[PDB]
Amino acid sequence: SGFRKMAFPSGKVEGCMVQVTCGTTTLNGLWLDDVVYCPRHVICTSEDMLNPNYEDLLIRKSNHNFLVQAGNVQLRVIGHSMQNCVLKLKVDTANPKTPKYKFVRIQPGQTFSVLACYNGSPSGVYQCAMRPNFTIKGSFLNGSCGSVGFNIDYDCVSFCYMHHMELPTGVHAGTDLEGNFYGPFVDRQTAQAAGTDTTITVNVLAWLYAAVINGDRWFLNRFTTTLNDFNLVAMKYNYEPLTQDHVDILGPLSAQTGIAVLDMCASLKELLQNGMNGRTILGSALLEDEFTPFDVVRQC
Amino acid sequence: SGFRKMAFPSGKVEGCMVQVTCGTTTLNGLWLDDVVYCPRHVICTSEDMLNPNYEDLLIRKSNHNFLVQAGNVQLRVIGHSMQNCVLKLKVDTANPKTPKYKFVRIQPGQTFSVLACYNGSPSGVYQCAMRPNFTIKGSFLNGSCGSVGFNIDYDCVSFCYMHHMELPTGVHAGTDLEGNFYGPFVDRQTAQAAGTDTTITVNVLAWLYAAVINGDRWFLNRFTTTLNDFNLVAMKYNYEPLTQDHVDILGPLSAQTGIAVLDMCASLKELLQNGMNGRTILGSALLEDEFTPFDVVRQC
Numbered sequence: 110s111g112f113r114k115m116a117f118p119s120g121k122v123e124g125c126m127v128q129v130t131c132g133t134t135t136l137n138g139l140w141l142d143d144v145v146y147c148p149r150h151v152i153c154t155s156e157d158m159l160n161p162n163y164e165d166l167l168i169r170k171s172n173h174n175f176l177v178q179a180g181n182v183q184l185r186v187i188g189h190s191m192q193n194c195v196l197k198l199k200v201d202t203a204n205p206k207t208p209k210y211k212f213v214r215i216q217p218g219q220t221f222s223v224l225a226c227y228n229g230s231p232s233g234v235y236q237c238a239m240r241p242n243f244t245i246k247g248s249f250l251n252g253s254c255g256s257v258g259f260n261i262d263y264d265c266v267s268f269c270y271m272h273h274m275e276l277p278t279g280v281h282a283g284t285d286l287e288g289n290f291y292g293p294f295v296d297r298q299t300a301q302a303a304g305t306d307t308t309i310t311v312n313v314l315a316w317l318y319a320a321v322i323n324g325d326r327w328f329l330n331r332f333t334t335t336l337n338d339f340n341l342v343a344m345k346y347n348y349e350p351l352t353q354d355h356v357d358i359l360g361p362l363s364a365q366t367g368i369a370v371l372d373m374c375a376s377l378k379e380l381l382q383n384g385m386n387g388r389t390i391l392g393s394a395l396l397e398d399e400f401t402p403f404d405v406v407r408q409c
Numbered sequence: 410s411g412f413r414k415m416a417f418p419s420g421k422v423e424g425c426m427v428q429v430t431c432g433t434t435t436l437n438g439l440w441l442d443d444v445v446y447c448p449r450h451v452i453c454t455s456e457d458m459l460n461p462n463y464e465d466l467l468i469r470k471s472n473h474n475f476l477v478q479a480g481n482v483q484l485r486v487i488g489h490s491m492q493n494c495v496l497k498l499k500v501d502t503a504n505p506k507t508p509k510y511k512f513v514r515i516q517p518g519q520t521f522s523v524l525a526c527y528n529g530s531p532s533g534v535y536q537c538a539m540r541p542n543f544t545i546k547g548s549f550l551n552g553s554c555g556s557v558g559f560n561i562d563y564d565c566v567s568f569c570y571m572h573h574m575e576l577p578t579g580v581h582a583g584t585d586l587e588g589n590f591y592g593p594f595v596d597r598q599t600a601q602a603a604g605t606d607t608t609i610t611v612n613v614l615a616w617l618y619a620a621v622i623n624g625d626r627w628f629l630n631r632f633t634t635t636l637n638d639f640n641l642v643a644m645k646y647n648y649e650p651l652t653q654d655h656v657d658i659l660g661p662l663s664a665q666t667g668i669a670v671l672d673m674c675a676s677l678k679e680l681l682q683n684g685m686n687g688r689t690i691l692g693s694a695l696l697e698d699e700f701t702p703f704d705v706v707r708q709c
């Protein structure tokens with residue numbers, strides 16, 4: 110038993126991390142087959158961060174303006190291409206450690222693991238959820254751009270995120286592996302802000318089920334509720350409305366505990382309305398929403 | 410910026426995980442050079458879990474009674490030995506993926522990363538602290554015994570933990586990589602329980618420094634305190650007494666923020682005496698004690 114903020118094993122991604130340097134800017138890149146992927150702001154000059162034209166910036170570059178290094182081995186760039194907000198650098202050598210992989214664009218509320226790297230070297234791994242406002246509350250310092258987020262299904266790594274920038278609120282914004290930003294964010298120093306965030310309702314319910322699986326039942330009640338009445342209450346606490354799709358997803362967890370989804374919703378409505386009364390659930394004094402129903406099943 | 414429960418990258422350990430089966434018991438082993446390490450309860454039979462004699466059980470075994478599988482290939486056991494509470498299975502094949510490594514026994518309050526594996530396959534990774542009562546609040550299911558905990562210095566893996574059993578309170582017990590249990594625990598089914606735990610004071614203070622580094626100052630105050638007066642209060646909340654060794658260790662964090670260690674102690678004293686007043690620190694409604702001063706510096 111026990112329940113932890115658990116991340117995926119990171120070895121399949123560690124073997125793909127490289128250092129990418131252009132001009133005076135160094136960040137990380139992802140080396141799959143014979144292509145190194147990295148944020149396109151690597152070619153942004155330190156004087157052109159307000160409104161750079163990346164199409165112009167890149168056409169003015171040659172292959173010898175990109176230095177890629179795998180460990181202590183320099184890779185030779187043999188061509189280059191831009192795809193939305195990321196660069197693709199073709200190299201002489203295919204990465205022999207390339208795992209089976211996919212590029213996946215994820216919905217808000219889904220989780221992934223982040224492999225935090227600096228100068229091509231992994232420093233740590235942690236679990237994130239894509240917030241409803243399309244930001245992530247990550248942990249990134251200078252030189253961390255190009256670090257990636259991912260999931261592993263069986264033996265295939267599904268890359269879903271690459272880090273680009275930190276917002277004024279202390280949260281992080283980035284793209285999928287095809288260069289498309291999550292949310293309304295752009296890679297230039299204009300006025301940008303995270304939208305109003307919301308709490309991921311289906312994840313809180315999944316996590317309450319995890320607590321029941323681990324023998325922790327104090328927060329349940331004899332009551333039930335309709336889905337519509339629950340949503341009327343949940344919205345007052347800035348929770349995502351609960352959909353029938355979410356109810357169906359929680360099905361296997363309901364079956365494991367014997368607690369109908371709407372009964373667990375009534376339990377959450379009581380927790381929201383009254384608080385935890387000084388108690389904790391799975392060691393937390395607040396309602397945790399970074400565990401999906403799939404995370405709960407996989408760990409339990 | 411940002412601050413996460415960050416674990417070490419796990420690739421160096423993943424390449425060392427194997428499956429060990431003896432009789433009808435399957436668990437994990439750690440394969441370094443030509444030796445596979447695993448809990449000695451792997452030879453404990455059903456219905457002999459109350460008072461097994463492991464010296465007597467092992468002498469009744471041959472090398473061919475141990476099956477070790479790396480990936481999908483068998484290793485040949487060519488010798489065996491017991492060292493305290495773990496078995497060493499010498500095999501014909503040396504692991505080409507053996508990292509630089511140490512075996513380290515750690516003090517309570519220190520943190521390490523846990524690579525949870527089943528049937529030789531890594532499933533996830535998370536961060537733990539050795540609790541003062543020598544248990545860990547981990548996440549382990551059936552078949553997880555033999556999973557290991559570790560730190561990475563530079564490129565060298567310091568293995569500090571191997572999982573053996575779960576206590577009736579829901580917490581876990583195990584050994585160093587030489588088979589010596591942390592705390593007063595034995596691998597036999599007699600009445601054992603976790604002792605009264607305490608909160609790791611020096612880690613809470615380190616984590617409060619991390620909050621200041623990342624912009625949370627609401628919990629600070631203009632007050633200060635003596636070390637003896639602080640310990641008089643902290644003990645009333647089931648906290649570890651703070652030593653001068655701890656104060657010295659917090660030095661670099663005091664220097665980075667400009668907040669004297671004893672000033673931060675006065676801040677923690679206020680937090681213990683009044684609560685958080687509905688606010689959070691680094692996203693937590695609880696005082697977190699699973700970050701050492703070394704972890705705070707690494708992540709900041």
Ligand SMILES: CC(C)(C)NC(=O)N[C@H](C(=O)N1CC2(C[C@H]1C(=O)N[C@H](C#N)C[C@@H]1CCNC1=O)SCCS2)C(C)(C)C
Pocket residue numbers: 136150153158249250251252253254272273274275276277281295296297298299300301410
């Ligand atoms: C745009 C907006 C106003 C929303 N904010 C910002 O401009 N923020 C900057 C930012 O992050 N930038 C700027 C660009 C590159 C990228 C970057 O290199 N950020 C570091 C990477 N490497 C990693 C940052 C630092 C800590 N945490 C992170 O993750 S993106 C635009 C064109 S240059 C700050 C450096 C945080 C001020």
Ligand SMILES: CC(C)(C)NC(=O)N[C@H](C(=O)N1CC2(C[C@H]1C(=O)N[C@H](C#N)C[C@@H]1CCNC1=O)SCCS2)C(C)(C)C
Pocket residue numbers: 110436450453458549550551552553554555573574575576577581596597598599600601602
């Ligand atoms: C002694 C004490 C009363 C304190 N507790 C226990 O007897 N606990 C058991 C225990 O863990 N045992 C039994 C032995 C081996 C070991 C084990 O096989 N533990 C699994 C391994 N693999 C992994 C367990 C499963 C759940 N979570 C874990 O981590 S140790 C004694 C001689 S056989 C339970 C199975 C949890 C009942």
